[PDB]
Symmetry: D2
Subunit: 418 residues, 4 copies
């Protein structure tokens, strides 16, 4: 019966067309949902109590929209998110600051600059930078974040024709991308936006950088408890296109059904994830990926190949900054990527990456370093057992380094859960 | 090379850089918002008739915007109400040549005594197509062909898949049906809403394999009922329906009762046109090949060679002589980039082929030529003349011409240069 | 049916799996399609020997002008023509020049004049290093020799490196493994063979594999295991023609050598993995607005769809037949021509079976076309290509004269 | 770098395009990986001569029990072992049974097999295997002291070809014995049997030998024919782990040159392997595996390709972890470190495995024992030309001593 679930008949098909023909509404998803949910905070979702239900429903990243609301307002939003998250101390939740932006203007307004200072002063994990048209706009955001905000991920919002055309140069200096379809479908003809979305997600997947699909994904749930047929389609297709993250704006910020909307995005994403045709996707991401002399990159593809060969339940990776986890996620394993880290910020930021489940390790270093490695891996296993990822008799891939400190992942081991 | 013959923009347009990519992923990465779609929109648009779309004046606007099939929803309105809808559709058509098919969508359980009277009414008024509600098995469609009776033998039956049993018994339904509607409205109530995309993609895929029309239906541009522009999810839905493989896309309340029926039709046409250029034919044609069975049907054999020929030379169009439409369906199933211009003497076949993606019907109304061979060539020039006027063909284009040797015997392909 | 000519292996989904399904019990049924070139010499000169060799499968007779006087080769030519006329299989006559032993020697020029005056069909030009070597040959053949196919022999390092400019201006290529394996290290020749055949297939231009294919049969009645391997693999690499030199020119078993090449080729041809090969030749091939090329691929696609027995093509110069052959149909290409020279030259193209039509033009052209197609069918029946009920593709044109092929028709045999 | 070892052809998108990119100026860099089996006889029995042959690349000495007394073969064994010791160069020793034979499992074969155990042969080539029980008769003959001897079944007739799958199931490997096969079945069908059996062995991960007349003419000539070099190259391209010499080394006048010629051809052909297709096709068809050694191997091989790893260093006791690497045909050399002298000789049956006998008392700490073998691996590879400083290598080891290979590490050579 294992082979009846999570669309494995379809995953085994020999062509894409045959894989489509074998999709089965009776094949239940079993894997953990892997596409992260970004929920925009507003009057419908500011309260600590609302945020707790949203966390339980699946929210992974809380978006602050600085197009509206004072610093004081956003400061309250941030504190309420942190209090909701800590009420479960457990789900790390990242905090993303989405800039007001231009409204050939400069890459940053005076308002933008003050807003990014605020976000650094408040430890935001992510910036969604508006109206990025060229790499210098990204550099401008980086500089305004200044020295204390070097670890903040910059996700460039592509919102107009120029940003689409200069995409390669924007992507190169950015940590990731948002397909900002709201403004995009005003700035270019609305019937073209799906080409820009598909193009940008394809290119981000190739580059191993996170990509966010945003705006009106479940629009009618602002007023209705259930979405339209086009809205469920759009969520599922964003996941099939390759998006790491899917986003809610008014559905959570102001609508009448914020929690049901998060839950609806979770339910669709899980079905869509199981329908991904990994056989074609992994092979193309291989052929099109370049040779690397980087041991983390080399170890990562070896581990994903290995995971596919034994239907591994998970890949446990010890990571300090999230990078080794990102390099696993870029090959889209079906196996869950369980990222054990000591860094609370990296546990939050890896939610930018499809299929990465962070575990914040809070135990004091062991004297023998190799003993500390194994204790974190064990932490990894036990948490996976108790959270549903792992059963005794499962096979996991463990991915670790030869010495302490970031940059030295280079070891892959195959392990049975007992 | 071909740049001289066809132009220097030609290969910039139509997403052709993405089309010659070696992998699906590289194809996605090469999609280009500045590659204008030159080809004629090929996915048919079904528009549900209601208060917003009953004016003869309105219907003519809708035809111009791209409506190809008028849907009559027998869930509401008397026989007299629907007779009038049929009447106004036919007058808009003749008061202009673009055939519009007329489809009767049964009430079903809300085959009832009511449905039988509705189907008899449909034959009486010469409907081209029945959308049969809640087909759960093959016998359900036999009940429908029986109701249509002897006078209704040429009516196409498109089975609406609306619940779990329909999805589960899909293969036996498709065997006995002319086509399928993925009826997402009720399906999304009868099964969990988050599974409908699985049922949609499976059904469009299997219909594509079987060479039968498939319609994607319901809430595609819903917000346009009250808004002049659609949501980002709605445009996405239309585009992916076309990329999924759908022959037809549908509007319900958007045309039946909304305030922007004409703008909705126009928006589907614009999305469908972009999406069709973005189809990765290299993979699709190859998978349709490897899966489809060997065939000793000469018309089937000619069509695949004709489509292959069309791709080798960037044929502007495949002109096919068809009596029932079948030869044009068998071209359509290989999804040429070239328009399939189908010349037929059968006004009904001409209306019904709108169910098949990429078929542009041309009704020919001249008495046969004394010499048949002369009758063929005359219809073919009619195809070419109509094609030139409508912007399909220019002098110097290449076309593929598909005819027969005897007067269901299509079995000749000819490569022809437009004078 | 499906336990013959490796069809189980043909259906396989990958090359690995096609190989695993090759079956020594699956008998070939299609007519042998790779043409056999036999070098004429003391063992093969007599009319009586040439008749046994035609029966055995020789398609092209090679005159090696490294030895023998004009009188000697004139005798070889006349003996081939008498053997051929004794029957019916057209046999081409190919003049293989002496060459440098300076593009063209004075000797080469006299030899080429001789071959033109004697109506030879093909020239194997020795030591071709660059496009100008081919042009020289072409000029030496002069005006009366415009219709003679030039097959450039690649025999050294420069020729391999400059292969693309040689291939562009040549009708075809010979992998002249004899001198090549001396000019470059012997352990590399297989690379130059595979590259050049691959490139000739992509270009749709005939390629010949030559030299030592069955060498030990010069003295022995049976070949070695490496020799059968080499023939089978030349066919699987993509060669249009395979060649015999000493095996037929001077050895003790000329006829058996031809018979052995025939038997191997037939088995190898059935082992061709068309699924992969057609798709790759379709993909790599370039868009074309030439109606003959468009019709040809459409016709080969159609033939694969209905397991067609043959593609009957009407051709004047052979070109429409070459453009079919370049997609390697499993179906036999039956080329109906009035041109005796074209019926001989099409033997350069894998899988083309010429039929010389000698009947008088019908007054109504369209009647002449149908009579030739029918000629094609009846001969196909009598010769074993076609059973009643088979399906054939017929490829013809819209107007008289070459260059106008543009019609394809699907026909059932009755 | 990327101009050598046919790397431009390696990154082609299609097989046909890969053929078109093969390049006679792309020199091989990797170590020759296909093993060379040399039959021992009067031309190749002297210790001096066997030494020259080992330097030329012989990896396996074949004893043909069709000819010569037990004493004759005891001396052949003696001289191979002395040549090996008088230099590290593990040479396997294979006993090829007489089997059902007629000259100008028998009682004789059993005495030969028992003699083989007595003298510690590593491999048996079992003649005329027709079915699975025949292989069981041979492992019975070898008895309890012969349990580690590998049994390579010779397929020599129609019945063995037909029952091949059951033969392969129970055998350690296969020899395509083309000599007798090409008399028992039509000669023109042997290439089909060869290609199938190499394909099925490749799929099964078991070694396959191509044998007989590969360089036959070198018995009397110092240079091979063009069909012979072709046949060696195609056997390597077909997927053979081992290529063999019979009369060319046993009785001919150029044994050393024959070995050298096979080494040179094998090296070129191995670079011309289109790994992208092969690795991909081996993936799809090979089954989901829950064995940690198989999982590590495929992950190690993928890793090796991602970084152009010069070597995969594996610690192995029986050879198995190295065989499971070798079945994916890495371009990187598989350097197999083992304490088992007999494992080290036997792994030569597996393409691309370079054994290293490690001779040191275990270290106090097991983890310390592992890294000393790994370092022994790196130092040998450095000395032998496999590794340079700054290279990347993939290291495969286990978690517990004793079928527990389950770790790969990426390591930069310093
Ligand atoms: O993903 P990153 O940031 O490169 O971290 C990976 C690092 O984590 C580790 O596995 C453990 O390092 P620490 O014990 O110092 O936390 C290192 O061996 C490895 O270099
Ligand atoms: O698509 P269909 O219904 O099979 O039509 C194909 C028929 O059209 C034709 O081209 C023309 O037929 P008619 O002129 O008799 O109407 C026939 O040759 C062919 O049999
Ligand atoms: O292969 P080629 O030399 O172009 O010949 C093809 C020609 O044969 C024909 O079918 C017959 O032409 P003919 O009447 O001159 O014999 C032409 O229609 C066609 O153009
Ligand atoms: O390939 P094999 O025969 O299964 O041996 C691999 C074994 O070698 C090792 O890497 C080394 O351990 P040993 O000390 O027993 O040689 C084991 O951990 C591993 O299980």
């Amino acid at each position: 019966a294992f082979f009846q679930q999570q669309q494995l008949p379809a995953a085994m098909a020999d062509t894409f067309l045959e894989h489509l023909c074998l999709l089965d509404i009776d094949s239940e998803p079993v894997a953990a949902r892997s596409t992260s949910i970004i929920a925009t905070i507003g009057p419908a979702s500011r309260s600590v109590e609302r945020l707790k239900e949203m966390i339980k429903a699946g929210m992974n990243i809380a978006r602050l929209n600085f197009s509206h609301g004072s610093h004081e307002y956003h400061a309250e939003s941030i504190a309420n998110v942190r209090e909701a998250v800590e009420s479960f101390a457990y789900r790390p939740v990242a905090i993303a600051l989405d800039t007001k932006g231009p409204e050939d203007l400069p890459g940053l307004s005076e308002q933008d600059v003050r807003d990014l200072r605020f976000g650094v002063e408040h430890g935001v994990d992510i910036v969604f930078a508006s109206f990025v048209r060229k790499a210098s706009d990204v550099a401008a955001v980086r500089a305004a974040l200044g020295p204390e905000g070097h670890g903040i991920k910059i996700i460039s919002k592509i919102e107009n024709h120029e940003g689409v055309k200069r995409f390669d140069e924007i992507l190169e200096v950015s940590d990731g991308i948002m397909v900002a379809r709201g403004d995009l479908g005003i700035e270019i003809p609305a019937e073209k936006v799906f080409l820009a979305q598909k193009m940008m997600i394809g290119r981000c997947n190739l580059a191993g950088k996170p990509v966010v699909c945003a705006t009106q994904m479940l629009e009618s749930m602002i007023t209705k408890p259930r979405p339209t047929r086009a809205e469920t389609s759009d969520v599922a297709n964003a996941v099939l296109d390759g998006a790491d993250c899917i986003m809610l704006s008014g559905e959570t910020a102001k609508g009448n059904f914020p929690v049901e909307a998060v839950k609806m995005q979770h339910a669709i994403a899980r079905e869509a994830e199981a329908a991904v045709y990994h056989r074609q996707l992994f092979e193309e991401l291989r052929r099109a990926a370049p040779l690397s002399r980087d041991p983390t990159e080399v170890t990562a593809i070896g581990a994903v190949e290995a995971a596919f060969k034994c239907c591994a339940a998970a890949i446990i990776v010890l990571t300090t900054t999230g990078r080794s986890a990102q390099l696993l996620s870029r090959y889209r394993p079906r196996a869950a990527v369980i990222a054990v880290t000591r860094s609370a910020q990296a546990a939050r930021q890896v939610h930018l990456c499809r299929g990465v489940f962070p575990l914040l390790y809070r135990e004091p270093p062991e004297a023998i370093w190799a003993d500390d490695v194994n204790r974190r891996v064990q932490f990894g296993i036990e948490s996976g057992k108790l959270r549903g990822f792992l059963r005794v008799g499962d096979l996991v891939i463990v991915v670790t380094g030869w010495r302490p400190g970031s940059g030295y992942t280079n070891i892959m081991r195959v392990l049975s859960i007992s």
